[PDB]
RNA sequence: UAGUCGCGGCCUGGAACGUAUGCGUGAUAUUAGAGUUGGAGUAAGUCGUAACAGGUUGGGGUAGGGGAACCUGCUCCAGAGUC
Protein backbone atom coordinates (compact mmCIF):
# COMPACT_ATOMS: atom_id res chain seq x y z
CA UNK A 1 0.00 0.00 0.00
CA UNK A 2 3.03 2.24 0.50
CA UNK A 3 3.88 2.20 -3.21
CA UNK A 4 2.86 5.84 -3.58
CA UNK A 5 5.20 6.88 -0.76
CA UNK A 6 7.93 4.87 -2.45
CA UNK A 7 7.03 6.62 -5.71
CA UNK A 8 7.20 10.05 -4.06
CA UNK A 9 10.65 9.13 -2.73
CA UNK A 10 11.56 8.16 -6.30
CA UNK A 11 10.14 11.45 -7.61
CA UNK A 12 12.22 13.43 -5.12
CA UNK A 13 15.45 12.26 -6.80
CA UNK A 14 14.81 11.72 -10.54
CA UNK A 15 12.52 13.58 -12.96
CA UNK A 16 9.33 12.06 -14.20
CA UNK A 17 10.47 10.59 -17.52
CA UNK A 18 12.33 7.64 -16.03
CA UNK A 19 11.19 4.03 -16.14
CA UNK A 20 13.26 3.28 -13.04
CA UNK A 21 10.73 4.94 -10.75
CA UNK A 22 8.05 2.32 -11.37
CA UNK A 23 10.81 -0.27 -10.92
CA UNK A 24 12.18 1.28 -7.72
CA UNK A 25 12.73 -0.63 -4.47
CA UNK A 26 14.53 0.56 -1.35
CA UNK A 27 15.43 -3.03 -0.44
CA UNK A 28 17.25 -3.79 -3.67
CA UNK A 29 20.04 -6.33 -3.92
CA UNK A 30 23.27 -5.38 -5.71
CA UNK A 31 22.66 -8.37 -7.95
CA UNK A 32 19.55 -6.78 -9.37
CA UNK A 33 21.39 -3.47 -9.65
CA UNK A 34 24.15 -5.06 -11.72
CA UNK A 35 21.50 -6.54 -13.99
CA UNK A 36 19.45 -3.32 -14.18
CA UNK A 37 22.49 -1.30 -15.18
CA UNK A 38 23.14 -4.19 -17.55
CA UNK A 39 19.71 -3.58 -19.09
CA UNK A 40 20.24 0.05 -20.12
CA UNK A 41 21.89 1.58 -23.19
CA UNK A 42 21.76 5.36 -22.67
CA UNK A 43 23.75 7.66 -20.42
CA UNK A 44 20.52 9.31 -19.27
CA UNK A 45 19.46 5.96 -17.81
CA UNK A 46 22.69 5.38 -15.89
CA UNK A 47 22.43 8.96 -14.62
CA UNK A 48 18.88 8.17 -13.45
CA UNK A 49 20.14 5.01 -11.75
CA UNK A 50 23.02 6.87 -10.13
CA UNK A 51 20.87 9.58 -8.55
CA UNK A 52 18.36 6.96 -7.48
CA UNK A 53 20.82 4.43 -6.09
CA UNK A 54 24.04 6.20 -5.10
CA UNK A 55 23.62 4.74 -1.60
CA UNK A 56 23.63 1.05 -2.51
CA UNK A 57 26.51 0.72 -4.99
CA UNK A 58 29.46 -1.46 -4.10
CA UNK A 59 32.39 -1.91 -6.46
CA UNK A 60 30.65 -4.32 -8.85
CA UNK A 61 28.07 -1.62 -9.61
CA UNK A 62 30.83 0.85 -10.46
CA UNK A 63 32.49 -1.73 -12.73
CA UNK A 64 29.24 -2.51 -14.56
CA UNK A 65 28.60 1.23 -14.75
CA UNK A 66 31.93 1.87 -16.48
CA UNK A 67 31.28 -0.99 -18.92
CA UNK A 68 27.88 0.51 -19.68
CA UNK A 69 29.62 3.83 -20.24
CA UNK A 70 31.86 2.15 -22.83
CA UNK A 71 28.75 0.48 -24.28
CA UNK A 72 27.04 3.84 -24.68
CA UNK A 73 30.29 5.22 -26.10
CA UNK A 74 30.04 2.76 -28.96
CA UNK A 75 26.22 2.47 -29.27
CA UNK A 76 24.49 5.58 -27.85
CA UNK A 77 24.91 8.21 -30.60
CA UNK A 78 24.27 11.31 -28.48
CA UNK A 79 27.38 11.08 -26.34
CA UNK A 80 28.66 14.02 -24.31
CA UNK A 81 32.21 13.53 -22.98
CA UNK A 82 31.86 16.41 -20.52
CA UNK A 83 28.79 14.94 -18.80
CA UNK A 84 30.60 11.59 -18.75
CA UNK A 85 33.65 13.24 -17.17
CA UNK A 86 31.70 15.03 -14.41
CA UNK A 87 29.78 11.82 -13.68
CA UNK A 88 33.11 9.95 -13.58
CA UNK A 89 34.24 12.57 -11.08
CA UNK A 90 31.08 11.89 -9.06
CA UNK A 91 32.08 8.20 -8.92
CA UNK A 92 35.16 9.02 -6.78
CA UNK A 93 33.86 9.70 -3.21
CA UNK A 94 31.62 6.62 -3.25
CA UNK A 95 34.77 4.59 -3.92
CA UNK A 96 36.70 6.34 -1.17
CA UNK A 97 33.89 5.87 1.34
CA UNK A 98 33.05 2.21 0.56
CA UNK A 99 35.33 0.38 -1.86
CA UNK A 100 38.51 1.43 -0.07
CA UNK A 101 37.07 -0.15 3.07
CA UNK A 102 35.43 -3.29 1.67
CA UNK A 103 37.16 -4.02 -1.64
CA UNK A 104 38.17 -7.58 -2.36
CA UNK A 105 40.72 -8.08 -5.13
CA UNK A 106 38.11 -9.42 -7.59
CA UNK A 107 35.91 -6.33 -7.40
CA UNK A 108 38.74 -3.82 -7.60
CA UNK A 109 40.33 -5.64 -10.54
CA UNK A 110 36.96 -5.62 -12.30
CA UNK A 111 36.66 -1.85 -11.86
CA UNK A 112 40.18 -1.17 -13.08
CA UNK A 113 39.57 -3.36 -16.12
CA UNK A 114 36.39 -1.40 -16.77
CA UNK A 115 38.20 1.93 -16.60
CA UNK A 116 40.98 0.75 -18.92
CA UNK A 117 38.19 -0.63 -21.13
CA UNK A 118 36.81 2.91 -21.25
CA UNK A 119 40.22 4.23 -22.28
CA UNK A 120 40.59 1.58 -25.01
CA UNK A 121 40.62 2.32 -28.77
CA UNK A 122 37.98 1.14 -31.22
CA UNK A 123 39.94 11.26 -23.55
CA UNK A 124 38.21 10.11 -20.36
CA UNK A 125 40.47 10.04 -17.29
CA UNK A 126 40.37 9.44 -13.54
CA UNK A 127 42.85 10.68 -10.92
CA UNK A 128 45.86 8.38 -10.79
CA UNK A 129 46.06 8.52 -6.98
CA UNK A 130 42.82 6.56 -6.77
CA UNK A 131 44.11 4.04 -9.33
CA UNK A 132 47.30 3.39 -7.34
CA UNK A 133 45.43 3.29 -4.04
CA UNK A 134 42.94 0.80 -5.47
CA UNK A 135 45.95 -1.20 -6.69
CA UNK A 136 47.54 -1.32 -3.24
CA UNK A 137 44.22 -1.93 -1.48
CA UNK A 138 43.36 -4.90 -3.68
CA UNK A 139 46.74 -6.46 -2.92
CA UNK A 140 47.15 -5.46 0.75
CA UNK A 141 46.48 -9.04 1.89
CA UNK A 142 48.68 -11.85 0.64
CA UNK A 143 46.17 -14.70 1.00
CA UNK A 144 43.56 -13.61 -1.54
CA UNK A 145 46.40 -12.75 -3.90
CA UNK A 146 47.57 -16.35 -3.47
CA UNK A 147 44.15 -17.64 -4.44
CA UNK A 148 43.74 -15.18 -7.32
CA UNK A 149 43.27 -16.16 -10.93
CA UNK A 150 45.91 -15.48 -13.63
CA UNK A 151 43.26 -13.69 -15.66
CA UNK A 152 42.71 -11.38 -12.68
CA UNK A 153 46.35 -10.52 -12.21
CA UNK A 154 47.16 -9.90 -15.86
CA UNK A 155 43.91 -7.95 -16.16
CA UNK A 156 45.14 -5.75 -13.30
CA UNK A 157 48.43 -5.39 -15.18
CA UNK A 158 46.67 -4.33 -18.38
CA UNK A 159 44.66 -1.83 -16.37
CA UNK A 160 47.82 -0.36 -14.85
CA UNK A 161 49.47 -0.33 -18.27
CA UNK A 162 46.59 1.62 -19.79
CA UNK A 163 45.63 4.04 -17.01
CA UNK A 164 48.91 5.45 -15.84
CA UNK A 165 50.99 8.34 -17.20
CA UNK A 166 54.65 7.52 -17.89
CA UNK A 167 55.91 9.82 -15.13
CA UNK A 168 54.25 7.66 -12.48
CA UNK A 169 55.85 4.32 -13.36
CA UNK A 170 58.56 5.12 -10.80
CA UNK A 171 56.02 5.57 -8.01
CA UNK A 172 56.58 3.38 -4.98
CA UNK A 173 52.98 2.13 -4.75
CA UNK A 174 53.18 0.54 -8.21
CA UNK A 175 56.45 -1.06 -7.10
CA UNK A 176 54.75 -2.41 -3.95
CA UNK A 177 52.00 -3.87 -6.16
CA UNK A 178 54.63 -5.43 -8.44
CA UNK A 179 56.44 -6.82 -5.38
CA UNK A 180 53.29 -8.53 -4.14
CA UNK A 181 52.26 -9.79 -7.56
CA UNK A 182 55.68 -11.23 -8.41
CA UNK A 183 55.80 -12.92 -4.98
CA UNK A 184 52.43 -14.46 -5.77
CA UNK A 185 52.75 -15.35 -9.44
CA UNK A 186 56.26 -16.82 -9.49
CA UNK A 187 55.00 -19.82 -7.54
CA UNK A 188 52.04 -20.47 -9.86
CA UNK A 189 53.80 -19.75 -13.17
CA UNK A 190 52.48 -23.05 -14.51
C1' U B 1 44.40 4.37 18.18
C1' A B 2 38.65 2.20 23.00
C1' G B 3 31.75 1.81 21.76
C1' U B 4 32.19 3.65 16.25
C1' C B 5 31.02 2.02 11.83
C1' G B 6 28.79 -1.40 8.69
C1' C B 7 27.73 -1.25 0.87
C1' G B 8 27.44 -7.09 2.54
C1' G B 9 25.73 -12.41 5.61
C1' C B 10 21.95 -14.61 9.28
C1' C B 11 16.25 -12.68 11.71
C1' U B 12 9.81 -11.04 14.91
C1' G B 13 6.88 -8.70 10.82
C1' G B 14 1.89 -7.68 7.00
C1' A B 15 0.29 -9.26 2.20
C1' A B 16 -1.73 -10.00 -3.72
C1' C B 17 -1.69 -15.03 -5.10
C1' G B 18 -2.56 -20.58 -4.09
C1' U B 19 -5.30 -26.91 -3.04
C1' A B 20 -8.44 -30.17 -1.05
C1' U B 21 -13.35 -27.83 0.82
C1' G B 22 -20.35 -25.42 0.78
C1' C B 23 -25.07 -24.50 -0.29
C1' G B 24 -25.99 -22.46 -6.27
C1' U B 25 -25.58 -23.64 -11.26
C1' G B 26 -23.18 -25.89 -16.55
C1' A B 27 -20.37 -30.07 -19.35
C1' U B 28 -18.73 -34.73 -20.83
C1' A B 29 -19.04 -39.93 -19.03
C1' U B 30 -20.94 -44.38 -16.58
C1' U B 31 -23.65 -48.60 -15.58
C1' A B 32 -28.61 -49.57 -12.33
C1' G B 33 -33.29 -49.04 -14.93
C1' A B 34 -38.69 -47.56 -14.78
C1' G B 35 -40.99 -47.98 -19.78
C1' U B 36 -41.80 -48.28 -25.00
C1' U B 37 -40.57 -49.99 -29.76
C1' G B 38 -37.74 -52.22 -33.65
C1' G B 39 -34.31 -56.07 -35.96
C1' A B 40 -33.21 -61.23 -35.91
C1' G B 41 -34.07 -66.64 -34.82
C1' U B 42 -37.52 -70.86 -34.49
C1' A B 43 -40.61 -78.46 -37.44
C1' A B 44 -45.78 -78.84 -37.78
C1' G B 45 -51.26 -72.15 -34.33
C1' U B 46 -52.77 -69.18 -38.92
C1' C B 47 -55.61 -65.15 -43.33
C1' G B 48 -55.13 -64.17 -48.34
C1' U B 49 -52.70 -64.08 -53.39
C1' A B 50 -47.30 -59.78 -53.72
C1' A B 51 -44.01 -62.53 -56.95
C1' C B 52 -42.97 -65.89 -61.79
C1' A B 53 -46.22 -66.32 -69.74
C1' G B 54 -48.34 -65.09 -64.14
C1' G B 55 -53.31 -63.92 -64.63
C1' U B 56 -55.83 -55.13 -62.22
C1' U B 57 -48.29 -54.29 -65.54
C1' G B 58 -45.24 -53.12 -61.31
C1' G B 59 -42.34 -49.71 -58.94
C1' G B 60 -37.77 -45.38 -57.01
C1' G B 61 -41.37 -40.96 -55.71
C1' U B 62 -45.30 -37.96 -52.05
C1' A B 63 -49.97 -37.82 -49.60
C1' G B 64 -55.15 -40.51 -48.75
C1' G B 65 -58.62 -45.17 -47.79
C1' G B 66 -59.20 -50.82 -45.79
C1' G B 67 -59.90 -56.91 -39.93
C1' A B 68 -55.01 -58.46 -43.41
C1' A B 69 -51.73 -59.31 -48.60
C1' C B 70 -52.48 -53.75 -50.13
C1' C B 71 -54.90 -50.34 -53.69
C1' U B 72 -56.25 -44.65 -55.29
C1' G B 73 -53.59 -40.20 -58.51
C1' C B 74 -49.79 -37.82 -61.27
C1' U B 75 -44.33 -37.63 -64.83
C1' C B 76 -40.62 -41.34 -65.24
C1' C B 77 -38.18 -46.22 -65.96
C1' A B 78 -39.29 -50.24 -69.24
C1' G B 79 -34.95 -53.86 -64.85
C1' A B 80 -43.36 -57.54 -66.64
C1' G B 81 -45.31 -59.96 -70.78
C1' U B 82 -45.36 -59.72 -75.86
C1' C B 83 -47.19 -58.71 -81.24
Spanning CA of A13 to C1' of B81, the rounded length in angstroms is 114
Where do runs of H (alpha helix) occur along A29-104?
Answer: 30-37, 43-53, 59-75, 81-94, 100-102
Spanning CA of A95 to C1' of B62, the rounded length in angstroms is 103
Residue A103 DSSP SS3: coil
Residue A40 DSSP SS3: coil
Resolution limit, Å: 4.2
For chain A, how long is the longest CA-to-CA vector?
Answer: 60
CA A180 to CA A35: how far, in whole Å?
33
Helix, strand, coil fractions of chain A, as percent rounded to 5: 70, 0, 30
A54 touches strand B (CB under 7 A): no
Query: What was the structure determination method?
Result: cryo-EM
φ/ψ of residue A28, rounded to 5:
-75, 150
> What nucleotide is nearest A1 when CA is compared to C1'?
B15
Spanning CA of A61 to C1' of B17, the rounded length in angstroms is 33
CA A98 to CA A63: how far, in whole Å?
14
Q: Which DSSP state fits A85?
A: H
Amino acid sequence: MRKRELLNEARALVPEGSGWLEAYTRNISPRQLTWRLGKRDSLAAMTEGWQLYQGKFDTVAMAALLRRLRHAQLQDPGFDPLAAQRLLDDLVPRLRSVGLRFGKLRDITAYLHALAKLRSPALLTQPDALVLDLAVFATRNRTELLHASPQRLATLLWALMRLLPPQLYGSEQLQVVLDRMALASLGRLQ
